Each structure stands twice: as structure tokens, then as C-alpha cells.
Design a protein around this ligand. Structure first.
Ligand code: HEM
Length: 291
């Protein structure tokens, strides 16, 4: 399967910076969502789940085709709760009907991270919508109730290595688990709509307790009111993972730099970019624009 990036006709940096600003302006406006967390965390989760279907072996799945717009992927049990990120973006797609679905879902994730004061993420245009029959089947996204060997093995399919996996998981400092979506409940920290390295700090400094929640699932709970998933706590159980966790709890700039590279790579897996294709765009935030 080859998927070649095709820039939307005649579009350039300024067009996509207009779509960025539209998403970012609505993130500021619709602030009440999920008890004032706002839409940013569900939008970086949506960009991860449309990319996380990729399989390196046959180049199926991935962010290129925008296939989450089809019922099979929209109704995947693993995507429960992401309909709220879709409905947030649907106004903006009506306003810029020329951007492809893959591009709009991935730029929403980029915009949310930078607007929640994360690192800049280089983003590239050119994903092309593909037919309903290209939609990957349910079951390619990871279970939460498993251990470190499962996480390592699952992420080899998206060929991410240990460092990349640990840098990507730092995004679980954002938002929260919702019992009616996943059977898990609670936030992982106090700053859950500002991008920081707090996931790593909480993992190493809190007093975790294995408890059973109302959906009868086990999760790691702390006195402070935070929770960690079994696959999250996995990172301090494995010796290779645990020493990268310590590296990111001791250096927030290295965390930001490595997250930026692994999230771009995540979003680009499966796509062939021609050598005459434009460079990756670095978008300015509303704040850097005085907007
Ligand atoms: C083995 C890996 C992973 C598993 C099992 C997993 C699982 C989960 C689960 C069960 C939730 C709760 C969903 C809900 O109830 O609403 C969640 C939320 C979230 N995850 Fe993951 N995740 C994984 C990796 C990642 C990665 C790599 C990213 C992003 C780079 C990510 C970003 C998020 C975000 C931002 C949320 C919060 C959503 C919200 O607030 O609504 N996840 N994760």
C-alpha cells in the first residue's frame, strides 16, 4: 500500500494557519466542556486514535485516509467519547471545506498541544480522503488493563521504540478517564489542561494503591485524588521504561523535544511525501500572534 501526500489545490502556509487559528479560537470559546477542562485533551486523543490504527507491515490504517468519518471506525468501542472531538471540529470543516479529513483531525491534535502550552509540533499537509472500504477494522487500538511487555509489543506495530513510547505516554497528564467511555475513572494530576511533564513526576512521587472502580476494573489510585491505568503504572515496573521516566521527570525540555518528534512521527506514519512537497509548517500560537 503506497499513500502519497497531495497538497490541497493551491493551498499554502497561510491557509492552514487560518484553520489553526479557527480551532484555537474555538478552544478558547468552548471552555466549559468536561467540567472546564475544555476540548484540548479529547482533540489530542482523537489525533492519536486516527493514527494509532496504522500497521507497519502492510501500511494499512494510519492518519492518511481520514476513515474515522466512516461508521465502522466511528463506532469502534475503543473510540467511545471521541464523538465530542468530531462534533467540535465539524463547524471548522464547514468553514474550510477544502481541507481533507485526515489533515483536519491531525491538525486539531497539533493545535490543542501548542495552545495548552506544549512544544511546537512540525505538521505536514497532504492527507487525502479514501473510500469507506479502506476503513481499518476494530481492534487495532491498545487495551488499558495490561502490562509493560504488552505496551512494548503493541507499539512495535507502529514502530515506536521505548523512548518514543514513554515520551508519547506523557500526554496522559492531560484530561481524564471517564467511566462511561472506558470503565476507568479519574484524572492523573492537577494540571490536566496545561501540557507539562507531571505524568512522570506523579508516577514517581505519589503513593499508589491498586483499587477496583465502579465498572469493576482495577486501577492505581492515590491519596491526592489521581489515578493511573495498569498500562500507565507499567512504566515504573519495567527497568528500561523506568529509567526514561526518571529522565523526563528530571528534564522538562528533553520531554518536550522528544514528545514533539514522536507525535509528528505518529501523525505521519504511512505517508509518502514527494521531494517537491513543502517543508513542515510550524504554526504560531494565538498568543504569539497577539490574537
Ligand atoms: C497503551 C497506550 C494507551 C492506552 C491503553 C490508552 C488508554 C486510554 C484510556 C482508557 C483513556 C480514557 C478514555 C476515556 O474514558 O475518556 C485514555 C485517555 C487519553 N489518552 Fe490514552 N492511551 C494510550 C496511549 C495514549 C497516547 C500515546 C496518547 C497521546 C499521544 C494518549 C492520549 C490520551 C489523552 C489526551 C486522553 C484524555 C482524553 C480525555 O480527557 O477525554 N493516549 N487513554
Amino acid at each position: 500500500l503506497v499513500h502519497v501526500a497531495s497538497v490541497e489545490k493551491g493551498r499554502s502556509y497561510e491557509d492552514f494557519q487560518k484553520v489553526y487559528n479557527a480551532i484555537a479560537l474555538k478552544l478558547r470559546e468552548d471552555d466549559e466542556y468536561d467540567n472546564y477542562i475544555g476540548y484540548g485533551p479529547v482533540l489530542v486523543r482523537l489525533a492519536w486514535h486516527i493514527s494509532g490504527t496504522w500497521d507497519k507491515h502492510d501500511n494499512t490504517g494510519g492518519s492518511y485516509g481520514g476513515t474515522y468519518r466512516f461508521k465502522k471506525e466511528f463506532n469502534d468501542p475503543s473510540n467511545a467519547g471521541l464523538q465530542n472531538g468530531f462534533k467540535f471540529l465539524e463547524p471548522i470543516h464547514k468553514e474550510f471545506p477544502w481541507i481533507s479529513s485526515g489533515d483536519l483531525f491531525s491538525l486539531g491534535g497539533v493545535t490543542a498541544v501548542q495552545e495548552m502550552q506544549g512544544p511546537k509540533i512540525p505538521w505536514r499537509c497532504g492527507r487525502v480522503d479514501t473510500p469507506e472500504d479502506t476503513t481499518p477494522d476494530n481492534g487495532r487500538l491498545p487495551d488499558a488493563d495490561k502490562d509493560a511487555g504488552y505496551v512494548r509489543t503493541f507499539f512495535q506495530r507502529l514502530n515506536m521504540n521505548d523512548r518514543e513510547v514513554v515520551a508519547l505516554m506523557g500526554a496522559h497528564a492531560l484530561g481524564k478517564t471517564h467511566l462511561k467511555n472506558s470503565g476507568y475513572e479519574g484524572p492523573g494530576g492537577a494540571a490536566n489542561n496545561v501540557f507539562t511533564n507531571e505524568f512522570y513526576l506523579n508516577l514517581l512521587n505519589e503513593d499508589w494503591k491498586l483499587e477496583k472502580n465502579d465498572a469493576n476494573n482495577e486501577q492505581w489510585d492515590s491519596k491526592s485524588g489521581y489515578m493511573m491505568l495498569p498500562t500507565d503504572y507499567s512504566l515504573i515496573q519495567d527497568p528500561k521504561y523506568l529509567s526514561i521516566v526518571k529522565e523526563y521527570a528530571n528534564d522538562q525540555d528533553k520531554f518536550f523535544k522528544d514528545f514533539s518528534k514522536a507525535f509528528e512521527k505518529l501523525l505521519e506514519d504511512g505517508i509518502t511525501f514527494p521531494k517537491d512537497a513543502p517543508s513542515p509548517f510550524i504554526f504560531k500560537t494565538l498568543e504569539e500572534q497577539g490574537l
